[PDB]
Amino acid sequence: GPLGSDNWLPPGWRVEDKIRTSGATAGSVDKYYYEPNTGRKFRSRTEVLYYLEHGTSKRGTKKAENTY
Length: 68
Hints:
Methyl-CpG-binding domain-containing protein 6
């Protein structure tokens, strides 16, 4: 039966299996989440949860001006 890892992700959300690209500690497995709504993808559920919470990426800046 299904693992239930994406038991939270709806039909709209898609999950893809991706094996670790590392080598020293590689050998694991990490699934990704793709959102057809905006075509956004996530590597970990935590990232998806954060996006869903804000209801959008809302990516901005918070670094100092760093200008003379």
